Amino acid sequence: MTLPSGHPKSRLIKKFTALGPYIREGQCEDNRFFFDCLAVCVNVKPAPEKREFWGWWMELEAQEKRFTYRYQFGLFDKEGNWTVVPINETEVVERLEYTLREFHEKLRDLLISMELALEPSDDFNDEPVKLSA
């Protein structure tokens, strides 16, 4: 299943794998790359699979001759379904803000290897998250 970007989905998935965990490549009507990152677990007393974990998903859309991503926060359930919930304990929210930037740092390097244009998220209007909170 190749993407409209022009590049092979086999190479993109394999390459993106070097920026984190194994990407879930399969069949889907929409052409987007969604990754599940784990920052901090909700609880520790109970089991891991029995509890959910915190982590913002990164969904980017490969353009014609460039790449673009966006910042989207949420939660990584065990069912692998879309679930948006509030972040408890500011201590954790701070961890996401840090990893958020570091995520783009490694993502930029990869795109640089393919010489793909990079741009900010249209959802942002000169109002980046407070990294120094």
Side-chain angles (χ1 to χ4, degrees), residues 38-44 47-48 51-54 92:
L38 297 185
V40 178
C41 311
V42 179
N43 288 14
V44 56
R51 259 279 163 199
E52 314 105 55
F53 314 135
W54 298 117
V92 183

Short mmCIF file of all heavy atoms in Angstrom, two decimals, residues 38-44 47-48 51-54 92:
data_model
loop_
_atom_site.label_atom_id
_atom_site.label_comp_id
_atom_site.label_asym_id
_atom_site.label_seq_id
_atom_site.Cartn_x
_atom_site.Cartn_y
_atom_site.Cartn_z
N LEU A 38 4.62 6.11 24.69
CA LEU A 38 4.32 5.92 26.11
C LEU A 38 5.18 6.85 26.97
O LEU A 38 6.40 6.76 26.96
CB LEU A 38 4.56 4.47 26.51
CG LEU A 38 3.68 3.43 25.83
CD1 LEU A 38 3.93 2.05 26.42
CD2 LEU A 38 2.21 3.81 25.96
N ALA A 39 4.52 7.74 27.71
CA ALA A 39 5.21 8.67 28.58
C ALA A 39 5.13 8.24 30.04
O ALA A 39 6.14 7.85 30.64
CB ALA A 39 4.64 10.07 28.41
N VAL A 40 3.93 8.29 30.60
CA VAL A 40 3.72 7.90 31.99
C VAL A 40 2.40 7.15 32.15
O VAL A 40 1.38 7.54 31.60
CB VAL A 40 3.71 9.13 32.93
CG1 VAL A 40 3.45 8.70 34.36
CG2 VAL A 40 5.03 9.89 32.82
N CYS A 41 2.44 6.07 32.92
CA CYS A 41 1.25 5.26 33.16
C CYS A 41 0.31 5.95 34.15
O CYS A 41 0.75 6.66 35.04
CB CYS A 41 1.65 3.88 33.69
SG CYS A 41 2.95 3.06 32.74
N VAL A 42 -0.99 5.72 33.97
CA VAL A 42 -1.99 6.32 34.84
C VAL A 42 -1.81 5.87 36.29
O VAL A 42 -1.74 6.69 37.20
CB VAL A 42 -3.42 5.97 34.38
CG1 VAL A 42 -4.45 6.57 35.32
CG2 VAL A 42 -3.65 6.44 32.95
N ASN A 43 -1.73 4.56 36.48
CA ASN A 43 -1.55 3.99 37.81
C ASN A 43 -0.42 2.97 37.83
O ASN A 43 0.03 2.51 36.78
CB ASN A 43 -2.85 3.33 38.29
CG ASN A 43 -3.92 4.34 38.63
OD1 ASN A 43 -3.82 5.52 38.28
ND2 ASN A 43 -4.96 3.89 39.32
N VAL A 44 0.05 2.63 39.03
CA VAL A 44 1.13 1.67 39.18
C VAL A 44 0.69 0.46 40.00
O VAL A 44 1.15 -0.66 39.78
CB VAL A 44 2.36 2.31 39.86
CG1 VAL A 44 1.97 2.92 41.20
CG2 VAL A 44 3.47 1.28 40.03
N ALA A 47 -2.34 -3.53 37.16
CA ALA A 47 -1.51 -4.04 36.08
C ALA A 47 -1.35 -3.00 34.97
O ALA A 47 -2.13 -2.06 34.85
CB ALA A 47 -2.12 -5.32 35.52
N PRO A 48 -0.31 -3.18 34.14
CA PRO A 48 -0.02 -2.27 33.03
C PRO A 48 -1.05 -2.37 31.92
O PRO A 48 -1.56 -1.36 31.44
CB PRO A 48 1.35 -2.74 32.54
CG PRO A 48 1.43 -4.17 32.94
CD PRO A 48 0.66 -4.28 34.23
N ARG A 51 -4.37 -0.97 32.83
CA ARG A 51 -4.44 0.48 32.95
C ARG A 51 -3.95 1.15 31.67
O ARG A 51 -3.24 0.55 30.87
CB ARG A 51 -3.61 0.96 34.14
CG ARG A 51 -4.44 1.28 35.37
CD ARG A 51 -5.07 2.66 35.28
NE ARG A 51 -6.16 2.83 36.23
CZ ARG A 51 -7.09 3.77 36.12
NH1 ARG A 51 -7.07 4.62 35.10
NH2 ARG A 51 -8.06 3.86 37.03
N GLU A 52 -4.35 2.41 31.48
CA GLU A 52 -3.95 3.16 30.29
C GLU A 52 -2.67 3.96 30.56
O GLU A 52 -2.27 4.14 31.70
CB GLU A 52 -5.07 4.10 29.86
CG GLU A 52 -6.44 3.45 29.83
CD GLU A 52 -7.31 3.85 31.01
OE1 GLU A 52 -7.50 5.07 31.21
OE2 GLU A 52 -7.80 2.95 31.72
N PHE A 53 -2.05 4.43 29.48
CA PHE A 53 -0.82 5.20 29.60
C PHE A 53 -0.95 6.54 28.89
O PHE A 53 -1.75 6.69 27.96
CB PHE A 53 0.36 4.42 29.01
CG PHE A 53 0.40 2.98 29.44
CD1 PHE A 53 0.65 1.97 28.53
CD2 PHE A 53 0.20 2.64 30.77
CE1 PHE A 53 0.69 0.65 28.93
CE2 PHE A 53 0.24 1.32 31.18
CZ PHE A 53 0.48 0.32 30.25
N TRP A 54 -0.17 7.52 29.33
CA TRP A 54 -0.20 8.85 28.74
C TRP A 54 0.77 8.96 27.57
O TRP A 54 1.84 8.36 27.59
CB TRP A 54 0.13 9.91 29.79
CG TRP A 54 -0.85 9.95 30.92
CD1 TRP A 54 -0.59 9.69 32.24
CD2 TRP A 54 -2.24 10.28 30.84
NE1 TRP A 54 -1.74 9.83 32.98
CE2 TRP A 54 -2.77 10.19 32.14
CE3 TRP A 54 -3.09 10.63 29.79
CZ2 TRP A 54 -4.11 10.44 32.42
CZ3 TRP A 54 -4.42 10.88 30.07
CH2 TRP A 54 -4.92 10.79 31.38
N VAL A 92 3.40 15.21 35.05
CA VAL A 92 3.40 14.37 33.86
C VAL A 92 3.32 15.21 32.59
O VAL A 92 4.07 14.98 31.64
CB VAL A 92 2.23 13.37 33.87
CG1 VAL A 92 2.29 12.46 32.66
CG2 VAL A 92 2.23 12.56 35.16
#
